[PDB]
């Protein structure tokens, strides 16, 4: 089961030129494409090795789409200012996210298409891909325009068709990088706080995909209450890292085990501090 | 306008740090809104010029994330840090690189 | 590949 997503950001300037448009494409937790309107020569560019099979005609075509969407977002930003009666002085943000989820047979599971204005939910295509949920009275104006323009039907055509067919093509071309599960490299470190307590930090490094569970156990019992978890973070090589830390009494370390659940591990892996 | 979200900052190496061993210093900035942000890697207080960043992207709560990264060689003597300025910060926040985190 | 059809304005 896999997903493709496109994330767009448009950021208006207060008479500092037209809005900047940035797009990223993701298959699962791998970025494969990008477009930046502020680049010297704005063009879709590759970000994963498996999209580089695609020839010159693919980058030229997708560049047309982002350039049109940049113009579309610019118009959308002008209208949004009016809906909310905001000054032309302020900088504003329109974000979009759309894409498809497929199963192992490559059949559509779920379609997505939603927008955010200044960090708030604005409008979202419903699960049925025929209707829209508006978050407020400005979004209802958009809803009404789009119901008149039969917009959902065009979005549904892309989500159930094109989206699925592209994701299937990428899953055949990047099969061993996209259906891989890199297991995490795991280790525990020990940092004395004081005379009485020490920190035990459980590391997970170089794993893909990002989804992971680190859990500290004392004599097989969960201590998630006393566990500090960092947010899962990119290593910068398309793999992720995470750590879990628990403050334990000095001399009780051998009673603590770290439990790592990850797709790349056949079953959950159990770690202890190794002095 | 509207909503503002204060950025979370993580400073770390791609690989476990080894003195004299070539590595990558990362500054991961996430959970912020709006997208405008200033990020620098510092070596002994000095801005590193040769730093690359990821393309702007966002999470489930629509908050933004970026990775700023640079090739580096750790030493016992050298200090590295990440400097972040955003509308939500009164002054820039500096997070010192700790090998243990 | 992203949506070929122009998306309507908000």
Author numbering:
A (entry chain A): 2 to 276
B (entry chain B): 19 to 119
C (entry chain C): 1 to 10
Please give me the paper's original passages concerning this structure.
One intracellular protein that is frequently mutated in cancer is isocitrate dehydrogenase 2 (IDH2), somatic mutations of which can contribute to the development of AML via production of the oncometabolite 2-hydroxyglutarate (2HG). Mutated protein products derived from cancer driver genes, or mutation-associated neoantigens (MANAs), can be processed and presented as peptides by human leukocyte antigen (HLA) molecules. Here, we describe the identification of a neoantigen-specific TCRm antibody targeting the IDH2R140Q mutant peptide in complex with a common HLA allele (HLA-B*07:02), the structural basis of its specificity, and its functional activity in a CAR T-cell format.
The IDH2WT and IDH2R140Q peptides bound in essentially identical conformations, with alignment of the peptide Cα atoms yielding a root-mean-square deviation (rmsd) of 0.193 Å. In the IDH2WT peptide, IDH2R140 was held in place by residues located in the β-sheet floor and α2 helix of HLA-B*07:02. Specifically, IDH2R140 was secured via a salt-bridge with Asp114 (β-sheet), hydrogen bonds to Arg156 (α2) and Tyr116 (β-sheet), and π-π interactions with Tyr99 (β-sheet). The longer side chain of the WT arginine residue, IDH2R140, is buried deep in the peptide-binding groove and forms an additional charged interaction with Asp114 (HLA), along with π-π interactions with Tyr99 (HLA), that IDH2R140Q cannot form. However, superposition of the 2Q1-Fab bound IDH2R140Q-pHLA and IDH2WT-pHLA structures revealed a slight shift in the backbone carbonyl of IDH2R140Q, which is the only direct interaction between that residue and 2Q1-Fab.
